[model samples]
Target: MKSNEHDDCQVTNPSTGHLFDLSSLSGRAGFTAAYAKGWGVYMSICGENENCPPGVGACFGQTRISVGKANKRLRYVDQVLQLVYKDGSPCPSKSGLSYKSVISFVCRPEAGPTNRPMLISLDKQTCTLFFSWHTPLACELA
Candidate 1:
């Protein structure tokens, strides 16, 4: 099915209230769910140090639903591939785990559900791409 309307999406640091631009980055990006995942990875990298493997692009699951109209319920996978630095070090590796930033985006699918467009944000300073997924909820509760 399709949704009649689209909800406003945003990303902000709850503590600082700083808003991040979704288009500013180069890789896949998202808010809420993806944000949490990114934060988790960042923390893990910090804690594990050499034990943690380099970060790969963020990835989301795939879905099969298309709304001919804009702003509709849909599901699809999203990914943010990692970019290498000039020295061959991972982007995040150079930035170190101490840096913490959040990014958000307003997602709009150009094609059908199966071919949903991906939204990615790149942190130039860190060379990390953020990714997010937009999908219809299976159930709604009051």
Candidate 2:
């Protein structure tokens, strides 16, 4: 999804009135963060996939997870943009568990120095894909 398709994913800290707008980084096509054993996920910041298919915020192998698709809500914790996508496919090995993607965009000092995000960990037990992105946009707004 593009910026024109949805409202800017911006949130204001009610306590401090600080704004966090993640749509500012939507200029890039998308991001691919790889994990161990050929496992990885292709994701966007606040919209759907522009290169692949729309409505897919995170595409993992055969699974397409909808993270911020269709104007989904977003929030900020400290200097991190926290989001969760739970409407994806279920765990292949665990029938009782569903595939969930938890991504956090951490603020970095420089501009956009990192080209790609890092896969922190994937918890199979809870079926959560954890990702941490370092971007200048994550910094606190004045």
Candidate 3:
């Protein structure tokens, strides 16, 4: 849902590209659980307040999900994939082209072995690009 690299951006339900509980939900504050701060970004862009405190989300677009705190989810729980508009607002006025960062999820429980199948990966640009926030697709998967 992002072209350039712009973190802190959020989106509506991916199914229809629309916001949820348009009335009850305003910004990204109480969307997820207090501990879900790390996994709230997948659904919306939260402010300093954060989700309940501080989050990813999913499925059928009807069932809001908050699979945070998982051993595998821990690392990415707080990773917010902010998808800013492609407008040239932040770009140079006279520049022909430029660079932008698109910040952008996952399951598995850590409390106990739910015996659930899991997928894991980790990478970054300045680090290794193995799973850098720059290219989630490029991020290693298991």
Task: At residue 45, give the lDDT of candidate 2.
Answer: 70
lDDT of each: 0.26, 0.65, 0.24
Model 3 misplaced regions, further than 4 Å: 1-84, 93-101, 106-142
The best candidate in terms of TM-score:
2
lDDT of 2 by residue, 17-119 (tens): 7777777655336677766456567677767667557766676763445333323456677657776766555556554355667777787866456845687
Q: Rank the candidates by lDDT, best first.
A: 2, 1, 3
What lDDT tens digits, residue by residue, belong to model 1 across residues 1-142? Answer: 2221223212333434443322222222211123343333221100111212333122222221110111111221122111111222233556633222222222334323532223356455764434332322211112
**Model 3 agreement with the true structure over 43-119: per-residue lDDT tens digits:** 22222224322322211012333322111111122322232212111223344222221223222233132321111
**Candidate 2: misplaced stretches above 4 Å?**
1-6, 36-39, 62-71, 92-97
- Taking all chains together, each candidate's TM-score versus the true structure is 0.24, 0.73, 0.18
Best-first order by TM-score: 2, 1, 3
User: Which stretches of candidate 1 lie above 4 Å from their native place?
Assistant: 1-89, 92-94, 97-117, 138-141
> How close to the true structure is residue 113 of candidate 1, measured as C-alpha lDDT?
54
Compared with the true structure, the alpha-carbon lDDT of candidate 1 equals: 0.26
